[PDB]
Amino acid sequence: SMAMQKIFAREILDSRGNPTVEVDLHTAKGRFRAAVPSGASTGIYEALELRDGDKGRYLGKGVLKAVENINSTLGPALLQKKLSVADQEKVDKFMIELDGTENKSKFGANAILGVSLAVCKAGAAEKGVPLYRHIADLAGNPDLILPVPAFNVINGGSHAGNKLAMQEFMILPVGASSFKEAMRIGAEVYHHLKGVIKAKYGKDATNVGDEGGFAPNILENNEALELLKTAIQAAGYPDKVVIGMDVAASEFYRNGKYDLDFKSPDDPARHITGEKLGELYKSFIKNYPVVSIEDPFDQDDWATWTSFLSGVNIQIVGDDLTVTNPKRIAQAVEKKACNCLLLKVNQIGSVTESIQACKLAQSNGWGVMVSHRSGETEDTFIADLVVGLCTGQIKTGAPCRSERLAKYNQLMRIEEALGDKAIFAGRKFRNPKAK
Amino acid sequence: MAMQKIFAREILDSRGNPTVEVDLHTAKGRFRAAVPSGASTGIYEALELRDGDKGRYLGKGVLKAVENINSTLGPALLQKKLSVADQEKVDKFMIELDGTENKSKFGANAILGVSLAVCKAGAAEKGVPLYRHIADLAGNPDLILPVPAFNVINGGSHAGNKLAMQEFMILPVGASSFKEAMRIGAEVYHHLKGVIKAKYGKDATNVGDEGGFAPNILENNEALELLKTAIQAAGYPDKVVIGMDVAASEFYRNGKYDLDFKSPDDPARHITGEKLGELYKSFIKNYPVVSIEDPFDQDDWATWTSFLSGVNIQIVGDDLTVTNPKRIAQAVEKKACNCLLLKVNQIGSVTESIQACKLAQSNGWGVMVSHRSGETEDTFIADLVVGLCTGQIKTGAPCRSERLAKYNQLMRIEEALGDKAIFAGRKFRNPKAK
Ligand SMILES: [Mg+2]
Ligand SMILES: [Mg+2]
Helix, strand or coil, rough: CCCCCCCEEEEEHHHHCCCEEEEEEEEEEEEEEECCCCCCCCCCCCCCCCCCCCCCCHHHHHCCHHHHHHHHHHHHHHHHHHCCCCCCCHHHHHHHHHHHHCCCCCCCHHHHHHHHHHHHHHHHHHHCCCCCHHHHHHHCCCCCCEEEEEEEEEEEECCCCCCCCCCCEECCCCCCCCHHHHHHHHHHHHHHHHHHHHHHCCCCCCCCCCCEEEECCCCCHHHHHHHHHHHHHHHHHCCCCCCEEEEEEHHCCCCCHHHHHHCCCCCCHHHHHHHHHHHHHHHHHHHHHHEEEEEEEEEHHHHHHHHHHHHHCCCCCCCCCCCCHHHHHHHHEEEEEEEEECCCCHHHHHHHHHHHHHHHHHHHCEEEEECCCCCCCCCCHHHHHHHHCCCCCCCCCCCCCCCHHHHHHHHHHHHHHHHHHHCCCCHHHHCCCCC | CCCCEEEEEECCCCCCEEEEEEEEEECCEEEEEECCCCCCCCCCCCCCCCCCCCCCHHCCCCCHHHHHHHHHHHHHHHCCCCCCCCCCCHHHHHHHHCCHHHHHHHHCHHHHHHHHHHHHHHHHHCCCCHHHHHHHHHHHCCCCCCCEEEEECCCCCCCCCCCCCCCEEECCCCCCCCHHHHHHHHHHHHHHHHHHHHHHHCCCCCCCCCCECCCCCHHHHHHHHHHHHHHHHHHHCCCCEEECCCHHHHHHCCEECCCCCCCCCCCCEEEHHHHHHHHHHHHHHHHEEEEECCCCCCCCCHHHHHHHHCCCCCEECCCCCCCCHHHHHHHHHCCCEEEEEEEEHHHCCHHHHHHHHHHHHHHEEEEEECCCCCCCCCCCCHHHHHCCCCCCEEEECCCCCCCHHHHHHHHHHHHHHHHCCCCCCHHHCCCCCC
8 A cells, every 4th residue: 555655753842841752644635643642761561762861952851863763764664665554453563573672662662652643543534434433443343432531630649749648539420421511520520629729728729730630738648538529519519420549559668568658758657558558448438439549559569459459349450550561461360450451552652552452451351541641742542542442431631731631622522423322431431331 | 715614612721611612614624723711801802702601610611602603603604605715804704793893792702713713724725834824814925933932930810929920931032943942941941840849849830820830939039030040050041031921900009019919908018100110120130031011000001101111122012902903002102012912812803813913013013922821722823923923922831732732833833944944033022123
């Protein structure tokens, strides 16, 4: 196929003011553009992001090298192979084999993904179907599902300057009648939350973090949960909103125990065992509508994850545990460590591998939650992705900052286009096919 | 040339509030535009139509504006069979159909959404880029990349610090290109974050609506010194200058000005307009301050006139002028200011925005194209500032993608123009001068 006419890459700025890769692919159908969300340039289990490391330029975060790899090498090689733009698997296989390394470190995981994404968009256009339909086709899925959105509205953990140890406190409008109404509920709860924060914590307490949520200066994770409850009740949706958490416990594990005040000066006297931590989670589940907990234990604390899951009935999500990595996921499945995969496309580095990972988790009875990264762009690919993959759940920010709202707005447009055939996952978010 | 379909919807803006988006289809494809937040009440600007259902999005829905497009305005425009390239006749048609002075029959947000989508379609019909079509509509032969003005330290009425003045901006006028202006701006921003974190704490770096920081400070001199520190740490003291938006109407009190207006009332601390002017002269003498927006109250005309005559910097109307032709004519006649802030949604059509810019430039004024606090993923104003050749745009800190979307589009425009691209640089006030 001579469908692919031109491939050009550039450096643009992400939502945090750091460089990332953008790729334009041209065919007879037009120009197809995709950008890559920030990832990791080091790490043992994820695909390697290539960063320039020039400390005098963008504080070492340039992506000139990755961009050059596309313009000079990867792009020309792909165009010369004359592959169909609709054959996502063959295209991704070619790029993976040309790179030839397990972690995409020859060209950069960011270089390969940028191309992979643009090809996918062009493939949908060649077939004359929406991107969300092409993705479903690629996943062998006859149907399409609008996800429940999970909004990270109260923020703690390593990147927030409060004492609050747990990372993400999310609201999920599972009781909404449609995706459009899930956005209304989400936004109204957020607006009421801001007013509660201004009153209780001060006129200086309402600026936002990287994902659009708030970081009031609190320590108690129960106090964060009570704020969500207060905002839900203030908006008048107690019957329709549930809560999801991301603990990110690897961030506070030390010498075999867990520190829920780890942003205060070192003091092992305050550390708690994994067993006491599990008891705290059970109290959350009893006292609040907590339906999902991500990274409850450290990434290597396998026996503790396995024990915990056997005694609860909620969703337990792997992020640092699994890292969108086949070998790690296989360990988790075999050890029954968790029951939901967080899906970050840039951690694995191709559209095909991301789809494969989703389908394998689903075949083992797990849920899948599609995820943003903290460095996002105006790109909306992951909205079409979650719909075509039929997962029933996405986290892509508070309803604030347009690198977040761009995805939520796109999900609204997708539901609009589907008309009276649209299905919203609602209370079946964990598995939209459940009876 | 023919318009085939027009369809409007409600989307969420960058602060989580509804706004209007319009799709216009022609033989060339789909052309999509969204409207930034504005004002539903006011004497001098076009009226944004909000639903006012207090139970739905806290009264901020735009169902009525959207339905005005789908049910009335859209079908009326289509029936008229106008060329999508004739921006002037299209906008005239919609303005006369509405028939009010402030666009309050259909809503300024309804009219503007259609106006923007028509302009994008018309560029394609003519075989030229959007920025070139705008330059054609404005009568400009050349294209100019603007200096970006990044709002990196925030105060005034919508931050909870004591800092009375509203916006502290950095402008990389000494950059070699737009691409390098972005690199300088971003590096300064990252160094500023570190400076603020070390001085004011780990909890001091969350961001406002436009992506900037609100450290808990009182002194406007301390805001300026923070910029100086960040600029020096980044290594660009010879290439970055400073702009300010005072928004002085926010702290005008019974004929005087209160630079600690968020602290408990005490009229003994209030200062005269003359004293406030002397403070600005100190900023200009001791820091590289080159531009001040709304230095005085929106009705304090004599004080603006007197101040401008004794300073050689840029003085920008925002609340003074409100992108309103009658207000702008008064400011021209009185020599109140010498630069227009251009908010397309305050006037409500592309044609009137272009006319306002041209009238300002014909009077020797500069023009700075501006975002709104509630923005979207739309990048129209990037193409707009390049076609209008104004040399200057303020559209956010280099943080939050409703801001970066515009900055990234300006880098793409520069890339498309190649080695012929002209960057305003040190001629930002008037790119045609010298
Ligand atoms: Mg996580
Ligand atoms: Mg202003």
